[PDB]
Design a protein around this ligand. Structure first.
Ligand SMILES: [K+]
Ligand SMILES: [K+]
Ligand SMILES: [K+]
Ligand SMILES: [K+]
Ligand SMILES: [K+]
Ligand SMILES: [K+]
Ligand SMILES: [K+]
Ligand SMILES: [K+]
Ligand SMILES: [Mg+2]
Ligand SMILES: [Mg+2]
Ligand SMILES: [Mg+2]
Ligand SMILES: [Mg+2]
Ligand SMILES: [Mg+2]
Ligand SMILES: [Mg+2]
Ligand SMILES: [Mg+2]
Ligand SMILES: [Mg+2]
Ligand SMILES: [Mg+2]
Ligand SMILES: [Mg+2]
Ligand SMILES: [Mg+2]
Ligand SMILES: [Mg+2]
Ligand SMILES: [Mg+2]
Ligand SMILES: [Mg+2]
Ligand SMILES: [Mg+2]
Ligand SMILES: [Mg+2]
Ligand SMILES: [Mg+2]
Ligand SMILES: [Mg+2]
Ligand SMILES: [Mg+2]
Ligand SMILES: [Mg+2]
Ligand SMILES: [Mg+2]
Ligand SMILES: [Mg+2]
Ligand SMILES: [Mg+2]
Ligand SMILES: [Mg+2]
Ligand SMILES: [Mg+2]
Ligand SMILES: [Mg+2]
Ligand SMILES: [Zn+2]
Lengths: 224, 155, 206
RNA sequence: CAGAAGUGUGCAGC
RNA sequence: CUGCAUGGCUGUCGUCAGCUCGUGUUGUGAAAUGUUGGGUUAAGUCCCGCAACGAGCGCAACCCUUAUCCUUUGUUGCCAG
RNA sequence: AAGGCGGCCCCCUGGACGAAGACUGACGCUCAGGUGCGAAAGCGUGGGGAGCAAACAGGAUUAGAUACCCUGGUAGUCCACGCCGUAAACGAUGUCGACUUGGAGGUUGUGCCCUUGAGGCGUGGCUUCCGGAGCUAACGCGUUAAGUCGACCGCCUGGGGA
RNA sequence: GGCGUAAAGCGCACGCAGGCGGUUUGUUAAGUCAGAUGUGAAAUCCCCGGGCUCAACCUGGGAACUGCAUCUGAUACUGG
């Protein structure tokens, strides 16, 4: 990746000065039309370092969890996560999805057994009302958990799209001591993040660039 | 490995439309000796359930303290809420001169020789907080030297 | 408030009657009386043989009694020498000739009557009631009950004022008529008076 | 628009 | 004699829609959240949202009776031809 | 300064703040005792008296109603000159000085920029509301601190009695 | 150790005595620091040892007597 790629993606656009967080001050180049501009020549080396450590843990065969919740970003998140065989949460983050893993695993095994009886179990044996309600259960379980259904345990690292929106996941990962990689925007607080990646968290093309570089590095490390 | 202590049991209560519900709380500490300790506060409707929750909480939430061959590196002042705790290292064979709530913590930490005094509120929970805070602030010659860049011959 | 007795509400739905015979109004009361007498006798006799249940059937102007017990060899006696005494005394009480059959309760820990009697005996042994209750619940659950609850009532531990204490594990749907809720009650005669023990065990629906 | 008062004293649930 | 030493049984708020627990999280703590919010229902009934995720006792259903039909048997019941 | 100050005009008069310099050269801060100012009610002497209204009278309401409500009504409220010296006289927060992430507004100076405006960017004074670290028993405070410090003064030591 | 709400900021201000004092150079040596000398009665109190059949008691030596005073030096800080 190069600064021209990031400029093409518009990652330098921060938020309005009204909503800035002073902790981000070191990563700000300045303002234009009272909008903050993110310093790209700081971003680039930090992002390279983040990718280097991601590659390190990928070569350890570690399991990556991608996290985003945002209308358009969720689909690119899913696509990239599957593209590197890694796990994802792209709908609502459940409170306690990791710190309460010992519970949520029950809902995952429920999803598995519900799918197995749905497809192989000859689900048509049920009454129409029961079949309907159990299919709606299946739908909701899919939406909430399908991206981690096979994770089998805690992830080795979280990659996060918005440290201010997904702060719950960051705080849970800190509680568990798992390293957090996150895109951090001028309104976010970085202190929960181990590998801050300062940049716009809203432009779909910026998200595409970030997820692309991440998934490329993951595939690289997996191929070892 | 771990030594465990039960410091306190207290019966709290919730009022409800029908009357009073009584619940038990238990404060416990655990430690390896050798300067690792943690405390756990549990709640249940039964005393042994409260104690088991306290122990499970106290096996995580556990911190390291740089003990000086079984005493403190230097005197320390710890504070939490209303509880102020003074602790001072002591010569060998002094033993633990402390109150019960502090004696439990210092025993499971393995600090054989200490002088300690509680001031203000002796409330066991906040006393344990203040003692852990103090032990967590205590620092040792090697990392003081590392901070200041001197050799430890500076001692 | 009060609850319906969980066995009686399920009679004919999922629970059978413990007596089965047809009688006209003339002999009905005498049958019921002699059944009561034989039940009372057998309960007083076998008090340590872990008799769970007594079924009385009156075929062909005869009585036959089936005894369900978790300790069959004690009831049968060596070479069967004891059932002879039981059947003779039962023939004396009922007047009609008597037959006795014995059946094993394989897992007494899943029998509400035997669990209730166990807790009662332990209470009379001055065991701590908390331990008796916990042991009962844990054993029932580990042996595969779909659920259990137990209750003990009155002057527990010699306390000056009575209490009720109850403990529950698993699922216990008393309003579900399909539920085969086994239920029983027993009473411990401590030096302080009567302690009442109630046990409910759920073994699945239908 | 009107509508006042409620004798003393206790005990379990660790 | 003591229901103010008890068991069992029963009334009542009330057939009212409520009452709790595990794990997680927040608070020095008693505790809180869940169980609150927008709609909806006879109903903590159901759907969306949400640091909560699940579960239990309740609601509902299973049970009896009544309102329609069909098969089978047809006396001590019935009488279309 | 606080108590406080509200139609318009004139006379006398105090303080604050901003820009640019010039000047003196530690002349400063706090303050026991002391001195001054100090809402309303109240007091003295002389005026004025519309409205309002303690006291008081009558009518109601009520078990009663020395009240609440209604009809009246005196001191007082206003003016001049004295006295009194207290208030939830409150930010329930002593005066002075330094340091420490921000955001949105009000009011009043001033600099620069095509001044093009109902415009952009800087720099002072005072003031309102959120909130970060930190502090606090908690509530909360939060560059106008209840944060980190220094100087001086006033005050507290269980509830009643008081 | 405290003073927003638990007891506690005078209603506000001025100001004498008092407490406190930006920065630089020189000088003094009052405060401060160092050294020496005298004094600080014995007993009592601590330490090391003796004697009573042990102990309590008695007793040898030491330390201490946290101080006071007078000389001779230092001048960073404070005061002049
Ligand atoms: K009773
Ligand atoms: K909980
Ligand atoms: K003027
Ligand atoms: K004064
Ligand atoms: K009037
Ligand atoms: K009245
Ligand atoms: K008048
Ligand atoms: K007193
Ligand atoms: Mg105290
Ligand atoms: Mg009266
Ligand atoms: Mg009363
Ligand atoms: Mg009576
Ligand atoms: Mg409720
Ligand atoms: Mg609702
Ligand atoms: Mg329900
Ligand atoms: Mg909800
Ligand atoms: Mg006046
Ligand atoms: Mg007058
Ligand atoms: Mg007059
Ligand atoms: Mg009037
Ligand atoms: Mg006063
Ligand atoms: Mg005051
Ligand atoms: Mg604030
Ligand atoms: Mg301050
Ligand atoms: Mg007093
Ligand atoms: Mg105090
Ligand atoms: Mg008060
Ligand atoms: Mg006060
Ligand atoms: Mg004041
Ligand atoms: Mg002054
Ligand atoms: Mg003065
Ligand atoms: Mg002066
Ligand atoms: Mg000076
Ligand atoms: Mg001198
Ligand atoms: Zn953003």
């Amino acid at each position: 990746v190069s600064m021209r790629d990031m400029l093409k993606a518009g990652v330098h656009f921060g938020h309005q000065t009204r909503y800035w967080n002073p902790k981000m001050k070191p990563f700000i180049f300045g303002a234009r039309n009272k909008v903050h501009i993110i310093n790209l020549e700081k971003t680039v080396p930090m992002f390279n370092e983040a990718l280097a450590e991601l590659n390190k843990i990928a070569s350890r065969k570690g399991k990556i969890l991608f996290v985003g919740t945002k209308r358009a970003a969720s689909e690119a998140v899913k696509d990239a996560a599957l593209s590197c065989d890694q796990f994802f949460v792209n709908h609502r983050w459940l409170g306690g999805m990791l710190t309460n893993w010992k519970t949520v695993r029950q809902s995952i095994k429920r999803l598995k057994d519900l799918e197995t009886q749905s497809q192989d179990g000859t689900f048509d044996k049920l009454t129409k009302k029961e079949a309907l309600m159990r299919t709606r259960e299946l739908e909701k379980l899919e939406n909430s958990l399908g991206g981690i259904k096979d994770m089998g345990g805690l992830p080795d690292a979280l990659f996060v799209i918005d440290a201010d929106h997904e702060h719950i996941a960051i705080k849970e990962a800190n509680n568990l001591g798992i390293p957090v990689f996150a895109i951090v925007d001028t309104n976010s607080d970085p202190d929960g993040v181990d590998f801050v990646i300062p940049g716009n968290d809203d432009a779909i093309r910026a998200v595409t660039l970030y997820l692309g570089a991440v998934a490329a590095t993951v595939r690289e490390g997996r191929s070892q | 490995e771990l030594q465990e202590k039960l410091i306190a049991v207290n019966r709290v209560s919730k009022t409800v439309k029908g009357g009073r519900i009584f619940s038990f709380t238990a404060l416990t500490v655990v430690g390896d000796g050798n300067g690792r300790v943690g405390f756990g506060y549990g709640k249940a409707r039964e005393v042994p359930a409260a104690i088991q929750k306290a122990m499970e909480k106290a096996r995580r939430n556990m911190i390291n303290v740089a003990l000086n061959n079984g005493t403190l590196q230097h005197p320390v002042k710890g504070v939490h809420t209303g509880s102020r705790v003074f602790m001072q290292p002591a010569s060998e064979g002094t033993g633990i001169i402390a109150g019960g709530a502090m004696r439990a913590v210092l025993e499971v930490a393995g600090v054989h020789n200490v002088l300690a005094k509680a001031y203000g509120s002796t409330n066991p929970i906040n006393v344990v907080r203040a003692t852990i805070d103090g032990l967590e602030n205590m620092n040792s010659p090697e990392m003081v030297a590392a901070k200041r860049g001197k050799s430890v011959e500076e001692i | 408030g009060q609850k319906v007795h969980p066995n009686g509400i399920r009679l004919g739905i999922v629970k059978p009657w413990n007596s089965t015979w047809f009688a006209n109004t003339k002999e009905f009361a005498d049958n019921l009386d002699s059944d009561f007498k034989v039940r009372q006798y057998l309960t007083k006799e076998l008090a340590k043989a872990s008799v769970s249940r007594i079924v009385i059937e009156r075929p062909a102007k005869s009585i036959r009694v089936t005894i369900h017990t978790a300790r069959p060899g004690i009831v049968i006696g060596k070479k069967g020498e004891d059932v002879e005494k039981l059947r003779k005394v039962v023939a004396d009480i009922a007047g009609v000739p008597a037959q006795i059959n014995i059946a094993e309760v394989r897992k007494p820990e899943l029998d509400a009557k035997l669990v209730a009697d166990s807790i009662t005996s332990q209470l009379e042994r001055r065991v701590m009631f908390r331990r008796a209750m916990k042991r009962a619940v844990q054993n029932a659950m580990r042996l595969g009950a779909k659920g259990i609850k137990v209750e003990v009532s009155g002057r527990l531990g010699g306390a000056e004022i009575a209490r009720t204490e109850w403990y529950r594990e698993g699922r216990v749907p008393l309003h579900t008529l399909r539920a085969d809720i086994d239920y029983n009650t027993s009473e411990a005669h401590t030096t302080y008076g009567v302690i009442g023990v109630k046990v409910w065990i759920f073994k699945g629906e239908i």
